PDB file of C-alpha atoms in Angstrom:
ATOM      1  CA  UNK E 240      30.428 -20.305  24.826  1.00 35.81           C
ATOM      2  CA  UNK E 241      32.717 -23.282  24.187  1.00 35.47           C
ATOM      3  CA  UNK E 242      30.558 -25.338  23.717  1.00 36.07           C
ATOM      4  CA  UNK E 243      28.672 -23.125  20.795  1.00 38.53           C
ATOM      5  CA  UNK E 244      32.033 -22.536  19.310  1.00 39.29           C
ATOM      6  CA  UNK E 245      32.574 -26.317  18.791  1.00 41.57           C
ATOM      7  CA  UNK E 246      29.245 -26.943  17.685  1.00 42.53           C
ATOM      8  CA  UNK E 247      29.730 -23.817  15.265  1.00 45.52           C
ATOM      9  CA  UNK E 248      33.052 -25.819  13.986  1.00 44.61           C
ATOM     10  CA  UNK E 249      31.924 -29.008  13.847  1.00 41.89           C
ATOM     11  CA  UNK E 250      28.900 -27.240  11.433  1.00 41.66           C
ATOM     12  CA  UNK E 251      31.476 -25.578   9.245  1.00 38.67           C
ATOM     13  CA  UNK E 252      33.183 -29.139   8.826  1.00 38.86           C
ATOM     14  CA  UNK E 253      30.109 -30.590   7.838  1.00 38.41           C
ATOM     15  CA  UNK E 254      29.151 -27.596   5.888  1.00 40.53           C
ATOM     16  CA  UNK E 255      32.935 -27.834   3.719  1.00 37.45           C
ATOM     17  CA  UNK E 256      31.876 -30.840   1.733  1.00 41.88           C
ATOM     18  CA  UNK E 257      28.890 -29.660  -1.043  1.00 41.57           C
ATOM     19  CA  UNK E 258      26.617 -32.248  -0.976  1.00 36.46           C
ATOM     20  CA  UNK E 259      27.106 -32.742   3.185  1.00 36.85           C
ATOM     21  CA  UNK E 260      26.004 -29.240   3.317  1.00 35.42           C
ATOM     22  CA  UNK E 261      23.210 -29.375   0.760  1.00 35.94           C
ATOM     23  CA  UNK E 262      21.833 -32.811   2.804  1.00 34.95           C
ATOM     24  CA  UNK E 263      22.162 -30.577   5.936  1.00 33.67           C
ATOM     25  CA  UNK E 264      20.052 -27.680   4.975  1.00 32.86           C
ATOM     26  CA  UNK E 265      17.206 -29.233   3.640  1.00 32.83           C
ATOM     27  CA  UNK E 266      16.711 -31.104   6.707  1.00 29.63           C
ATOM     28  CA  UNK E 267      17.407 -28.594   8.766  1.00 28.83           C
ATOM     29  CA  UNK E 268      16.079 -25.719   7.525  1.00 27.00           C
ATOM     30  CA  UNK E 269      14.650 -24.351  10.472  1.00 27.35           C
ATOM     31  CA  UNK E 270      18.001 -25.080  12.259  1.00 24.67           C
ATOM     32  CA  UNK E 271      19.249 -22.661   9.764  1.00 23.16           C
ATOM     33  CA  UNK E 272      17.145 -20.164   9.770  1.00 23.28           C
ATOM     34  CA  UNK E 273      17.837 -20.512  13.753  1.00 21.75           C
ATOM     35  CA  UNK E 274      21.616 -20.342  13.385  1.00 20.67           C
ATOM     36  CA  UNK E 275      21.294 -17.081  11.053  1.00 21.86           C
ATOM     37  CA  UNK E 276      18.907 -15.379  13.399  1.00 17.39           C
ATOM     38  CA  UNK E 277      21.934 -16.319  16.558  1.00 18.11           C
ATOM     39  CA  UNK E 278      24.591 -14.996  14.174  1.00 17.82           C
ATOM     40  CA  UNK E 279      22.785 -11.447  15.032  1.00 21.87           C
ATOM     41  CA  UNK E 280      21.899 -12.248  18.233  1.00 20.47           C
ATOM     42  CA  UNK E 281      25.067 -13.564  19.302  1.00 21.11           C
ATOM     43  CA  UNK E 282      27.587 -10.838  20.606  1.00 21.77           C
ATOM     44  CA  UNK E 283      31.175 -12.973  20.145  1.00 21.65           C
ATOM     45  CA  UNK E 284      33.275 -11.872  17.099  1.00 23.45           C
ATOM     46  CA  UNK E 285      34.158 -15.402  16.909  1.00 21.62           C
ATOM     47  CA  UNK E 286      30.986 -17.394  17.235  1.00 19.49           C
ATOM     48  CA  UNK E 287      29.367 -14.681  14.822  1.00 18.60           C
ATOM     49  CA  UNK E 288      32.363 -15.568  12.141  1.00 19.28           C
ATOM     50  CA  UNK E 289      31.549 -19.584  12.121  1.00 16.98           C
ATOM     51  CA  UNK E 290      28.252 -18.874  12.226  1.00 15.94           C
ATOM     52  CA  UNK E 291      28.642 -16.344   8.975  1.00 15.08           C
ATOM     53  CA  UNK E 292      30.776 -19.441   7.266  1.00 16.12           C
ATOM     54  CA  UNK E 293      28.417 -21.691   7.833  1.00 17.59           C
ATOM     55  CA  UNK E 294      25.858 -19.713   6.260  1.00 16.57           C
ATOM     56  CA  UNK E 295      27.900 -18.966   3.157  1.00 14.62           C
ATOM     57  CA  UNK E 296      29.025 -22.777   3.336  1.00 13.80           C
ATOM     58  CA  UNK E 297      24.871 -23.566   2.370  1.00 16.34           C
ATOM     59  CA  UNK E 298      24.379 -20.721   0.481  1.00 15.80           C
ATOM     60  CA  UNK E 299      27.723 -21.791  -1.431  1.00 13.81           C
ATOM     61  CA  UNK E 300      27.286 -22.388  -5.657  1.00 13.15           C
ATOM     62  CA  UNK E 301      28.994 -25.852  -4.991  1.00 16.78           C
ATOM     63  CA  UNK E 302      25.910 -26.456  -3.235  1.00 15.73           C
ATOM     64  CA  UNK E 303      23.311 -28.489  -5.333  1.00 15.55           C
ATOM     65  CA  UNK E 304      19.991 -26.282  -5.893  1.00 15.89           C
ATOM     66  CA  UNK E 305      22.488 -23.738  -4.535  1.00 20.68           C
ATOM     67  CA  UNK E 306      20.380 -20.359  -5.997  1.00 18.25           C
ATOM     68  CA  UNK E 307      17.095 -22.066  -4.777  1.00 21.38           C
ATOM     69  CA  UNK E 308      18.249 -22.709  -1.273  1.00 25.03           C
ATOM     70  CA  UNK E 309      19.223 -19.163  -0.976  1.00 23.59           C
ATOM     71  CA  UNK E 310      16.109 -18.137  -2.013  1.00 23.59           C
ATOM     72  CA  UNK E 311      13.837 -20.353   0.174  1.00 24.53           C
ATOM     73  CA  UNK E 312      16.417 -19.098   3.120  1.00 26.92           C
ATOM     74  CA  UNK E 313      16.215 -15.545   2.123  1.00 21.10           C
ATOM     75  CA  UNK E 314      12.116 -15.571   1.544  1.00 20.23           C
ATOM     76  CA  UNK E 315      11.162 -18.023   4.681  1.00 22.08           C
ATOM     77  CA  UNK E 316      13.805 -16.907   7.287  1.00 23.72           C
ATOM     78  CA  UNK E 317      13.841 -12.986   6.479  1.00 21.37           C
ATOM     79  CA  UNK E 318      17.639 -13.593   5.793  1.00 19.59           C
ATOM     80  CA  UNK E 319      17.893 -10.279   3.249  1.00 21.25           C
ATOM     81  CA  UNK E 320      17.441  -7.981   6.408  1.00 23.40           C
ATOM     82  CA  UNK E 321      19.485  -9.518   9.055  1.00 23.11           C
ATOM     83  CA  UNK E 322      22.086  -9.214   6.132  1.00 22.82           C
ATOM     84  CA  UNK E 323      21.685  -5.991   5.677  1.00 20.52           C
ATOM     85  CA  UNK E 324      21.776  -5.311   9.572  1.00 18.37           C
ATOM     86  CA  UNK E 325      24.805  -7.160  10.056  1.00 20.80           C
ATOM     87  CA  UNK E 326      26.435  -5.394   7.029  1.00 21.31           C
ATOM     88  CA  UNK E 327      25.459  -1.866   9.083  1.00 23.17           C
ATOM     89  CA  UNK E 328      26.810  -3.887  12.132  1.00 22.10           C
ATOM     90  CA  UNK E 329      30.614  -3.908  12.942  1.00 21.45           C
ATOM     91  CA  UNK E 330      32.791  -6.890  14.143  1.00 22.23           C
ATOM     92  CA  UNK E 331      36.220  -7.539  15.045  1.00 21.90           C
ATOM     93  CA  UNK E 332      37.031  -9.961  12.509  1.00 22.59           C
ATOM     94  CA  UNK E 333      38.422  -9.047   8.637  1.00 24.19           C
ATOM     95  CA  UNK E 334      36.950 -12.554   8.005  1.00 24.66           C
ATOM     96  CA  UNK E 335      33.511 -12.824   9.203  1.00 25.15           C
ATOM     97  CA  UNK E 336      33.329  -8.648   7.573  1.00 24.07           C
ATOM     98  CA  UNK E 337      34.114 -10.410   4.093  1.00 24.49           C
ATOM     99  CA  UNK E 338      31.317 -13.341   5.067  1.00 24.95           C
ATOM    100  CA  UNK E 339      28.818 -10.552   5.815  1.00 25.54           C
ATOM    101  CA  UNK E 340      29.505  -8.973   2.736  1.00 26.83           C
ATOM    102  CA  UNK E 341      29.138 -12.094   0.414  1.00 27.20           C
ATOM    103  CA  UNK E 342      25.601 -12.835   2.825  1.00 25.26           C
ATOM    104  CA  UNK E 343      24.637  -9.539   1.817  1.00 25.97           C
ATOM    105  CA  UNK E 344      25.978  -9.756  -1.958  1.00 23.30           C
ATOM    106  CA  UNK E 345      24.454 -12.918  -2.203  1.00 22.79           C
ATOM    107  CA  UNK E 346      20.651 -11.658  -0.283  1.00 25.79           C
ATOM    108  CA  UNK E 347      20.632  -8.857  -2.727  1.00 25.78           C
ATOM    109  CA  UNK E 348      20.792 -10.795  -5.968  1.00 27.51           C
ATOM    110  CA  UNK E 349      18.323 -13.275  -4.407  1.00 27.58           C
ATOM    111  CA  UNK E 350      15.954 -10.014  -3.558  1.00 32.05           C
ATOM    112  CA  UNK E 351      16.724  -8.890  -6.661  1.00 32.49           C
ATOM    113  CA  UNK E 352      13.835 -11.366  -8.684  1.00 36.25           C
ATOM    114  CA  UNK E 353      11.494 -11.200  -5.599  1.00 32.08           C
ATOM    115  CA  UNK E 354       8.117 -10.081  -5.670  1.00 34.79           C
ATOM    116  CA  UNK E 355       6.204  -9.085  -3.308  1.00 32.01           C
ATOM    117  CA  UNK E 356       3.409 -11.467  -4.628  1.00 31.83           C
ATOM    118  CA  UNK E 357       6.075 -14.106  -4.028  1.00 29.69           C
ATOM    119  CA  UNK E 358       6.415 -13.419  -0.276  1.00 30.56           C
ATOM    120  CA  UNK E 359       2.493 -13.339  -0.156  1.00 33.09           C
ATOM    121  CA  UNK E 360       2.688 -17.172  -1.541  1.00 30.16           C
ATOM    122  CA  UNK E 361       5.438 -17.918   0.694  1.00 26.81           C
ATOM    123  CA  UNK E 362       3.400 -16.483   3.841  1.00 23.71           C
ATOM    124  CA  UNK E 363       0.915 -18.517   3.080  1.00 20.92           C
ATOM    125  CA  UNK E 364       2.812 -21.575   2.091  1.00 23.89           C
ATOM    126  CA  UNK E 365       4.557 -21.069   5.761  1.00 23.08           C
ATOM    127  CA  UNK E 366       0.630 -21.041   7.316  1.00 25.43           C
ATOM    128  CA  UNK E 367       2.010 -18.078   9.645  1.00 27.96           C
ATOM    129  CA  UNK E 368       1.595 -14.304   9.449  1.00 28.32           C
ATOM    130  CA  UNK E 369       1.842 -11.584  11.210  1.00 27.65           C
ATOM    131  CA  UNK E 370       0.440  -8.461   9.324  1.00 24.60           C
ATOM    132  CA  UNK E 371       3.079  -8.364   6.856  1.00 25.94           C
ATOM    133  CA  UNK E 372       3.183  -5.022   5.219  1.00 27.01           C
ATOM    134  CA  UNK E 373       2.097  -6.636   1.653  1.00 29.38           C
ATOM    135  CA  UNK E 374      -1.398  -7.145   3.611  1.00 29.97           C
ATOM    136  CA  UNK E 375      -1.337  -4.081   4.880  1.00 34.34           C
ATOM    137  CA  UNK E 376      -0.187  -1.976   1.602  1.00 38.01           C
ATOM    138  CA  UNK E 377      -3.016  -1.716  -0.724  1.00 40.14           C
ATOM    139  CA  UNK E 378      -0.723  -2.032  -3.792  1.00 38.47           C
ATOM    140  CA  UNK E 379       0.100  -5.856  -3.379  1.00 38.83           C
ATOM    141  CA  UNK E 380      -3.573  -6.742  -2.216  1.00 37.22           C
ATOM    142  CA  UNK E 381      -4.598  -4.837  -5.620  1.00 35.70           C
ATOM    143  CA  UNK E 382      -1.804  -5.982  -8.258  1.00 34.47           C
ATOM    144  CA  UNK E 383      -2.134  -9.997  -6.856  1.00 38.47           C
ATOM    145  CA  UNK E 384      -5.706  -9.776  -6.592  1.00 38.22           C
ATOM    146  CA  UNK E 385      -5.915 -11.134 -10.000  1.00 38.92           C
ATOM    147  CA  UNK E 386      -3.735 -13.709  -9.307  1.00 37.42           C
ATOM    148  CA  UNK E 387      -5.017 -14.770  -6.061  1.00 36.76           C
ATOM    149  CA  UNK E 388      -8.487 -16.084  -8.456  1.00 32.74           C
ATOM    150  CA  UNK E 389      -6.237 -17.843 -10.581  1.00 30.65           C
ATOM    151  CA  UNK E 390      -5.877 -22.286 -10.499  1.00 29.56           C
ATOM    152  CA  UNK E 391      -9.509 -22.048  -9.605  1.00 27.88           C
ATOM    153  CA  UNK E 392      -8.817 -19.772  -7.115  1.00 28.65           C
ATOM    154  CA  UNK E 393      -6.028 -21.477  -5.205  1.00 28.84           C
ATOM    155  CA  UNK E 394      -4.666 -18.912  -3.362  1.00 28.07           C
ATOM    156  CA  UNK E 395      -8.164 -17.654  -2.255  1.00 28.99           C
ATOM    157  CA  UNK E 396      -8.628 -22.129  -1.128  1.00 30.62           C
ATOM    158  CA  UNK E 397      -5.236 -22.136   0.334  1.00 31.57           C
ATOM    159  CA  UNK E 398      -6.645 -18.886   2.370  1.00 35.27           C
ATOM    160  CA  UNK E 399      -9.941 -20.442   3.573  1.00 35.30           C
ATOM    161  CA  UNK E 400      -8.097 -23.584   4.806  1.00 35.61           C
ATOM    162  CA  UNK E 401      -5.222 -21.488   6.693  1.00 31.66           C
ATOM    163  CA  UNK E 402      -8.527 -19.606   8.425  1.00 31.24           C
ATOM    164  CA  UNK E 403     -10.432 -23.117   9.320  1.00 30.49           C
ATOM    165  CA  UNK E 404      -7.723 -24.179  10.670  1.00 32.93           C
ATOM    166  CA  UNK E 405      -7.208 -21.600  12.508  1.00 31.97           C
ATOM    167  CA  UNK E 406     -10.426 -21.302  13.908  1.00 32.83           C
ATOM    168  CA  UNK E 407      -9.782 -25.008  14.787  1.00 32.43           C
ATOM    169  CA  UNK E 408      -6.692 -24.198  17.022  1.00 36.17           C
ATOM    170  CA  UNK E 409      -7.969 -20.597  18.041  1.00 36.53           C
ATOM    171  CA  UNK E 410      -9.304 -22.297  21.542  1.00 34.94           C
ATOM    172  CA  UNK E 411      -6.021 -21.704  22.771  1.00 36.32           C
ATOM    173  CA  UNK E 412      -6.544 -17.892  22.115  1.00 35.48           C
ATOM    174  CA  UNK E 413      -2.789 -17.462  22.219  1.00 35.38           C
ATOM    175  CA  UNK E 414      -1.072 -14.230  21.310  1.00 34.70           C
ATOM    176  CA  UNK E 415       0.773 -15.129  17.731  1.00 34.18           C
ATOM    177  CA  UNK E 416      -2.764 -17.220  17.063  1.00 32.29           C
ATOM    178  CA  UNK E 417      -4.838 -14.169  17.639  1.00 34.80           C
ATOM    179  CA  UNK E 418      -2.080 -12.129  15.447  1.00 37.82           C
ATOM    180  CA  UNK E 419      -2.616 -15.042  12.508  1.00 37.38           C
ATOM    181  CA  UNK E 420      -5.745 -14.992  12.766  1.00 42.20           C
ATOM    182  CA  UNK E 421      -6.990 -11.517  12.420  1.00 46.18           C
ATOM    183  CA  UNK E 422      -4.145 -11.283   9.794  1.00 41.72           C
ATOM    184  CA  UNK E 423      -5.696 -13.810   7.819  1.00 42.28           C
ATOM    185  CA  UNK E 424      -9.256 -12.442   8.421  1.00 42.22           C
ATOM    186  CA  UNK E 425      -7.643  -9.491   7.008  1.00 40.63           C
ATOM    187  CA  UNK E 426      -6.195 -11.098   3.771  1.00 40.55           C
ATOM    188  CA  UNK E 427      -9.791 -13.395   3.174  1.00 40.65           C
ATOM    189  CA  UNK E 428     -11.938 -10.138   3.915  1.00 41.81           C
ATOM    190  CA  UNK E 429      -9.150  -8.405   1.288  1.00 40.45           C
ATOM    191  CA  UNK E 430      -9.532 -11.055  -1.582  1.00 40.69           C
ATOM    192  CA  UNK E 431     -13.795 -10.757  -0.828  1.00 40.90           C
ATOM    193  CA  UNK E 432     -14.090  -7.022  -1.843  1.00 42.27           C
ATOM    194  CA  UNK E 433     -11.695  -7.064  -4.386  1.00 43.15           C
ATOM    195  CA  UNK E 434     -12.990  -9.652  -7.222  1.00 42.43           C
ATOM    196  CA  UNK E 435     -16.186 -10.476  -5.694  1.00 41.91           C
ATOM    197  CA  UNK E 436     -16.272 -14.081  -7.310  1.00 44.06           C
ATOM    198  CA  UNK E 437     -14.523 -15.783  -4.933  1.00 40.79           C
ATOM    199  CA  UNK E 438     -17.706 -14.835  -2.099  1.00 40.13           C
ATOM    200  CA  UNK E 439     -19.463 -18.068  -3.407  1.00 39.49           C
ATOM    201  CA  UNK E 440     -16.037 -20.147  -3.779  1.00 38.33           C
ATOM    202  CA  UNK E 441     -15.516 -19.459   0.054  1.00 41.24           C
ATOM    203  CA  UNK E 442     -19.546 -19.739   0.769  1.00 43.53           C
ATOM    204  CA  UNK E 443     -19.116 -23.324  -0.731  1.00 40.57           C
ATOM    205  CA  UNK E 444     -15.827 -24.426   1.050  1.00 41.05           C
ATOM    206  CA  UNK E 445     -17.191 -23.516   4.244  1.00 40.42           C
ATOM    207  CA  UNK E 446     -15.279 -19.826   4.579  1.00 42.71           C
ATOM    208  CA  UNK E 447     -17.686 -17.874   5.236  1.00 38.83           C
ATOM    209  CA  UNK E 448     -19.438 -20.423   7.603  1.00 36.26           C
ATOM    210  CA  UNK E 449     -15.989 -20.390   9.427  1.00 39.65           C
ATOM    211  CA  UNK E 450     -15.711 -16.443   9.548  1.00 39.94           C
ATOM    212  CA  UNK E 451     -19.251 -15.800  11.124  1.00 42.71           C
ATOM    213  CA  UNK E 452     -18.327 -18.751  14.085  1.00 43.39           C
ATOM    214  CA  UNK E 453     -15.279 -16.720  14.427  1.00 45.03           C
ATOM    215  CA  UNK E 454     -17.526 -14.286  15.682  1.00 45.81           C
ATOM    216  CA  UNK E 455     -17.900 -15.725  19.496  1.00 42.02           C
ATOM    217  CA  UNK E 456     -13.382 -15.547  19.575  1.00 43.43           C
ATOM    218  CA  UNK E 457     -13.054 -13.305  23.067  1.00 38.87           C
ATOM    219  CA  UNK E 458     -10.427 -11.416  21.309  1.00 38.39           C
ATOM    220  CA  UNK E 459     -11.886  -7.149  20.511  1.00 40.22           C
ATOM    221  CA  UNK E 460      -9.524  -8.029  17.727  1.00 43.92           C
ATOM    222  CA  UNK E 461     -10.717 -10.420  16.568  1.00 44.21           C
ATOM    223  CA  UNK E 462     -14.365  -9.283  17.018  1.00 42.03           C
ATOM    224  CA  UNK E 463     -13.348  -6.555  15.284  1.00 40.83           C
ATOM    225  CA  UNK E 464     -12.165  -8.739  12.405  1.00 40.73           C
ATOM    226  CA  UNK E 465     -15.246 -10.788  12.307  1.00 41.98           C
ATOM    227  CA  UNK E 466     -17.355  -7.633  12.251  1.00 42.91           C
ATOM    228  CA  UNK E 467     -15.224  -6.316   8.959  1.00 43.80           C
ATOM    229  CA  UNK E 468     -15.723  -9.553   7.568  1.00 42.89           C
ATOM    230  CA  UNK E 469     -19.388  -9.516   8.224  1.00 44.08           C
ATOM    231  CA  UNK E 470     -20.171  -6.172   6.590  1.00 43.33           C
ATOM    232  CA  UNK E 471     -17.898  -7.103   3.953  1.00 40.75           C
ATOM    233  CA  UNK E 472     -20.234 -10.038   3.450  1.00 41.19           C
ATOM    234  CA  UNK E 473     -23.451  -8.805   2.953  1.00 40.33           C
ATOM    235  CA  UNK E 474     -23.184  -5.675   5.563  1.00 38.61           C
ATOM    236  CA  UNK E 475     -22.115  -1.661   4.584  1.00 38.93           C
TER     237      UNK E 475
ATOM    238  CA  UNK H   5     -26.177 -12.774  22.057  1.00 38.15           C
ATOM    239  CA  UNK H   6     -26.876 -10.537  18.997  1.00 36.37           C
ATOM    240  CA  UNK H   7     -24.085 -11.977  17.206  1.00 36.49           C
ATOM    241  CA  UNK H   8     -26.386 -15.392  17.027  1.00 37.64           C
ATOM    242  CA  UNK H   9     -28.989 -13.735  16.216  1.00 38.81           C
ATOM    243  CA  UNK H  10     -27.581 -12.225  13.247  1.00 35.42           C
ATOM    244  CA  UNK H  11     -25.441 -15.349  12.233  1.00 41.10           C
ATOM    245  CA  UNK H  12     -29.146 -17.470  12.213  1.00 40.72           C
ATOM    246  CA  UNK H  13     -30.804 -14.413  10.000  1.00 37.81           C
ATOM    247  CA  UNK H  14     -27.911 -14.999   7.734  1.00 36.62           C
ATOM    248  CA  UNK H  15     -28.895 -18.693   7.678  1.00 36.96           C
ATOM    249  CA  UNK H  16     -32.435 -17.632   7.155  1.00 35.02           C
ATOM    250  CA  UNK H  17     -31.283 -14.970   4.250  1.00 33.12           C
ATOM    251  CA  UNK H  18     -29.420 -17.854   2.794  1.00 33.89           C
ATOM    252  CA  UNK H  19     -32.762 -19.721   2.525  1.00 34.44           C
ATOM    253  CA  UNK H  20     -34.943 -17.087   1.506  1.00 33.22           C
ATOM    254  CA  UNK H  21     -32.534 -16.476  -1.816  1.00 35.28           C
ATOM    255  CA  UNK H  22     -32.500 -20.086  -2.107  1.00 34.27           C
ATOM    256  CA  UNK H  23     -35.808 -20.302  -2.659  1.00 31.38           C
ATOM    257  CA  UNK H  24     -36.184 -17.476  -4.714  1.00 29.55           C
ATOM    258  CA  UNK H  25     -33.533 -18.764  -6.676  1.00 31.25           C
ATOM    259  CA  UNK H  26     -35.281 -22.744  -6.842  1.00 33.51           C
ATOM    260  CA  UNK H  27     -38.789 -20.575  -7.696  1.00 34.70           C
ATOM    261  CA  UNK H  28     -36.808 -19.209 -10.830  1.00 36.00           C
ATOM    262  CA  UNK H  29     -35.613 -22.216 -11.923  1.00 37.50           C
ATOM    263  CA  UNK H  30     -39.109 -23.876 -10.867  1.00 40.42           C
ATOM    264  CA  UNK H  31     -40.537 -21.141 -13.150  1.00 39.66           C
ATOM    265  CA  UNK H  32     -38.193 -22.153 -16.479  1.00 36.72           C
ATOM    266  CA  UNK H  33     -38.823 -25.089 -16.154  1.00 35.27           C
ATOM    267  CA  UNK H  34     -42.799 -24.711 -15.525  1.00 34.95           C
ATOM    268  CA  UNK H  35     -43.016 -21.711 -18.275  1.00 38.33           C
ATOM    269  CA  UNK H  36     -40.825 -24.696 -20.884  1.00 36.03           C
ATOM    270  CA  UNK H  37     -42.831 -27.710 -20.010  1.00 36.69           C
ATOM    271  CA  UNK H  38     -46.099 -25.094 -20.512  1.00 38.35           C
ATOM    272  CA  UNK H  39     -44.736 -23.602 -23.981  1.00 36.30           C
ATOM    273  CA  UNK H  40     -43.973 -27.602 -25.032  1.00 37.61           C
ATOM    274  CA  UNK H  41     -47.503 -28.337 -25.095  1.00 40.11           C
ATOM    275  CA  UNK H  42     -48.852 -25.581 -26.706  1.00 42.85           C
ATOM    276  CA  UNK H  43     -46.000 -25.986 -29.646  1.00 39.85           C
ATOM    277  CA  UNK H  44     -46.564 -29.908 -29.246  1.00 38.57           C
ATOM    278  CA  UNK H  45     -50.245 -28.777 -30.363  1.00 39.13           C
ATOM    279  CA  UNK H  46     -49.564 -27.103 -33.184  1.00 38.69           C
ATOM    280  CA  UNK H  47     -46.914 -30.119 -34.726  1.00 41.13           C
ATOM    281  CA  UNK H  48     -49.786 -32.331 -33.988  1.00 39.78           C
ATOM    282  CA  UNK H  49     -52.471 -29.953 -36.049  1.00 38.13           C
ATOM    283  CA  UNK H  50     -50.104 -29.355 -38.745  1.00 36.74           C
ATOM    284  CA  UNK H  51     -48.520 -32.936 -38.819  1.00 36.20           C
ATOM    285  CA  UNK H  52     -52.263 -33.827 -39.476  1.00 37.84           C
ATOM    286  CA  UNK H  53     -53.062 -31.240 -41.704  1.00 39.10           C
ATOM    287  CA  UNK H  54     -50.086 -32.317 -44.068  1.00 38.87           C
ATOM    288  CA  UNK H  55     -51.470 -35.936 -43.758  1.00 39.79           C
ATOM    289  CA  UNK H  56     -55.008 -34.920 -44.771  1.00 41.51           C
ATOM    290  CA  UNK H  57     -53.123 -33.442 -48.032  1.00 43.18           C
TER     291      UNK H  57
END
């Protein structure tokens, strides 16, 4: 615990100066995505108050690319919700309330000019999903589906490649794999029905070659993926 | 085992419309060339009937 608290102190140091703390978070991004999820996890009134200020420290104006850095935090680390569960949390500390509070403030405007086409893009930027409720809600997978098509059907490209590779590392059959990949199975099977043009975009960039070997994956879900797929192909 | 079986009648599908689809090109390209020479006879009649004038 001493040791944390230090290493939460000496981050809040480092954090003080704007351009330290604007070096910091873009090379360690996933260190702060890490340190936000531990401000929740972490019980101490104390170590959850550093770890609030060093939050706010990044996510500080003085920051350069301050609004964008929120953004990307609040978008690739989930850090609107864990702001809003920490606001409905209580702690012991006047201080690290009042940091919550700005975290939240400061989440909410960032939330405010999402879309949930924008956490689609960052999903699939991040090459890791987990049957995210804008592939599950019909409403986003009908509203982007234009959009998906669109710089020669990027998204739909970006899609196939996530799935290949994929299939590439799906020999280790792990749990989150198995999750990705029947998630993704579910977005490319998605973008197939809806605007049919894209079946000989994926036909020609090996998709559909990749989603019929898929096939032989041990997993019932992802059989049962492979099987949607299939129908969806040329099946009914 | 039926999964293979299904993925190689795919493969086979795949060629049958591919053929189908070269045929209809074949077939432009056959019924053009074939309409050419007919209208290439006719140029050449009238081309010599407006030299015999």
């Amino acid at each position: 615990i001493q040791l944390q608290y230090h290493s939460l102190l000496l981050i809040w140091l480092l954090t003080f100066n704007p351009v330290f703390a604007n070096e910091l978070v873009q090379k360690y991004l996933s260190d702060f995505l890490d340190l936000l999820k531990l401000v929740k996890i972490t019980i101490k009134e104390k170590v959850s108050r550093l770890c609030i200020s060093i939050i706010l420290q990044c996510c500080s104006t003085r920051v350069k690319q301050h609004k964008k850095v929120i953004k990307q935090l609040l978008l690739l680390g989930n850090a609107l919700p864990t702001v809003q569960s920490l606001s409905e949390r209580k702690y012991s500390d006047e201080e690290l309330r009042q940091d919550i509070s700005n975290l939240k403030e400061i989440l909410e405007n960032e939330y405010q000019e999402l879309t949930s086409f924008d956490e689609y893009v960052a999903e699939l930027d991040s090459k890791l999903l987990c049957w995210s409720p804008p592939h599950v809600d019909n409403g986003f997978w009908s509203d982007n589906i234009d959009e998906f098509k669109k710089d020669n059907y990027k998204i739909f490209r970006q899609l196939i490649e996530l799935l290949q590779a994929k299939v590439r590392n799906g020999d280790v059959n792990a749990k989150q794999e198995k999750i990705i990949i029947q998630v993704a199975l579910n977005d490319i099977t998605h973008v197939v029905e809806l605007l049919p043009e894209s079946i000989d975009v994926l036909d020609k960039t090996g998709g559909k070659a990749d989603i019929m070997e898929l096939l032989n994956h041990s997993d019932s879900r992802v059989k049962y993926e492979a099987l949607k797929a299939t129908q969806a192909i040329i099946g009914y | 085992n039926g999964i293979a079986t299904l993925l190689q009648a795919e493969k086979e599908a795949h060629e049958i419309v591919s053929k189908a689809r070269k045929y209809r090109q074949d077939k432009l390209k056959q019924a053009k060339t074939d309409a050419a020479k007919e209208i290439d006879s006719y140029k050449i009649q009238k081309d010599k009937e407006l030299k015999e004038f």
